[PDB]
């Protein structure tokens, strides 16, 4: 069962998404996204993306989601309605888990399902690469190349972040 770690994680990934997509109180919506993000990083790690995975934790969870929860406390929620105590929220949550359960049922049984795209249920391990013996991390080499190959990317990305600071100060001044 450990040989299907990626698939099991992706099932939890979808369940968390059905969590905040049914849109309970924003406080618990942030919790569903935080769990999904942590599971999402786990999936990326198991494909050899150690740096990319840790960026999710550092920047997406430790950065963006902290600010979401910060803003939710100040501007949105201070106490929440009990999760799944609302008709639409619970009905949406039940509907999502039924769709996920059936997708998982048919993919495991028939080893293949077809919705828009054709999906194979042999196991995500079968597509992996069989040749690895370099003395470095390919992922790290590709990211490090941002400063040599990606001059233009750095300029526009750097400009956008600076403009973000300016714009948000403009927006929030109020006059």
């Amino acid at each position: 069962m450990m040989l299907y770690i990626v698939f099991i994680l992706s099932v939890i990934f979808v369940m968390g998404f059905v969590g905040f997509s049914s849109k309970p109180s924003p406080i618990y919506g942030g919790l569903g996204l935080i769990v999904s993000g942590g599971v999402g990083c786990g999936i990326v790690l198991n494909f050899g993306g150690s740096f990319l995975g840790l960026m999710v934790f550092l920047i997406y969870l430790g950065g963006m989601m902290v600010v979401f929860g910060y803003t939710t406390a100040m501007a949105t929620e201070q106490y929440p309605e009990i999760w799944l105590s609302n008709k639409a929220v619970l009905g949406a949550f039940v509907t999502g888990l039924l769709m996920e359960f059936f997708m998982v049922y048919y993919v495991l049984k028939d080893k293949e399902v077809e919705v828009v795209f054709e999906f194979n249920g042999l196991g995500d391990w079968v597509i992996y690469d069989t040749g690895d013996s370099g003395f470095f991390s390919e992922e790290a080499m590709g990211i490090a190349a941002l400063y040599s190959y990606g001059t233009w990317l750095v300029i526009v990305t750097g400009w956008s972040l600076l403009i973000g600071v300016v714009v948000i100060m403009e927006i929030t001044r109020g006059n």
């Binding site: 698939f7 979808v14 905040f20 924003p26 390919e138 590709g142 990317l153 990305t157 927006i171």
Partner: protein, 98 residues
């Protein structure tokens, strides 16, 4: 395609449906927007990592950075809405009806 893609694509679809079906809180809809980006980040990373597209390894970072900056802008607008009305309810944003 491999089995994992089915679930990542489901997650994007779920968060997209969650984005298009509002309730009341504008905040709850912004979370669905960030959920969409998270699923894109994961699907992009899986495709790039598995194929050994080395120079594309930086693309998920740029995606995350630009989407977080756009999320900061969204949160700022939500705060300005909450200042005007005292809540982030989307039903108060109906002046332009006329």
């Amino acid at each position: 395609m491999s089995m994992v893609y089915m679930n990542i694509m489901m997650a994007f679809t779920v968060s997209l449906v969650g984005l298009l079906m509002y309730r009341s809180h504008l905040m709850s809809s912004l979370l669905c927007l960030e959920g969409m980006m998270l699923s894109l980040f994961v699907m992009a990373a899986l495709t790039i990592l598995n194929s050994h597209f080395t120079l594309a390894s930086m693309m998920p970072i740029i995606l995350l950075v630009f989407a977080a900056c756009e999320a900061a802008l969204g949160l700022s607008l939500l705060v300005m809405v909450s200042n005007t009305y005292g809540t982030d309810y989307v039903q108060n944003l109906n002046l332009l009806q006329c």
